[PDB]
Design a protein around this ligand. Structure first.
Ligand code: K0G
Ligand code: K0G
Length: 165
């Protein structure tokens, strides 16, 4: 199972790790992708997870979008986890750099409650532009299921742990 995670709350754990490497090692039931509404896995966690699946995640996502249309900001869809997980929960957090509403971050985290355990990144953090300290706060205050957060950046990980209330 998950190893070397710092316990933040009864159900939220955190580790300074590459979510791709965590997924390949653990092969969790659910890996969360930090998706956009179009499921275009270009950069950040999405580009990294997609690259780890040899683009199979993008091919599957484009078929999903052709059939269903785009996701909502704050929404999600369950697709295959390919070589990384049983499933991938593609969650759309608000992208502040593309001018989306930060209030939708709580709705985005609510999607995690439909899964008993997940390997996940901090939503709307990184290239999405939100304050990662705020994202972790919304996560622990919204998610009730077991979430194992992988924070790629060491310095960010250190800042998150040392500032967590
Ligand atoms: O690219 C990454 N790792 C990886 C990808 C494919 C295969 C093996 C390892 N990690 C990463 C995570 C978050 C943001 N950017 C990059
Ligand atoms: O500091 C960050 N975001 C942020 C914080 C405060 C205000 C606005 C944005 N993200 C970040 C990204 C990559 C590595 N470390 C940190």
């Amino acid at each position: 199972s998950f190893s070397g995670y710092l316990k933040l709350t009864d159900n939220v754990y955190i580790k300074n790790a590459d979510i791709v490497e965590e997924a390949k090692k653990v092969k969790p039931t659910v890996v969360v992708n930090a998706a956009n509404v179009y499921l275009k896995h270009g950069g950040g966690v999405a580009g990294a997870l997609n690259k780890a699946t040899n683009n199979a995640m993008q091919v599957e996502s484009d078929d999903y979008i052709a059939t269903n249309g785009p996701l909502k900001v704050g929404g999600s869809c369950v697709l295959s986890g390919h070589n990384l997980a049983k499933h991938c929960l593609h969650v759309v957090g608000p992208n502040v750099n593309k001018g989306e509403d930060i209030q939708l971050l709580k709705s985005a985290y609510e999607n995690f409650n439909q899964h008993e355990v997940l390997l996940a990144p901090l939503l709307s953090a990184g290239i999405f532009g939100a304050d990662p300290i705020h994202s972790l706060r919304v996560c622990v205050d919204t998610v009730r299921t077991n979430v194992y957060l992988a924070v790629f950046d060491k310095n960010l990980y250190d800042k998150l742990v040392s500032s967590f209330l």
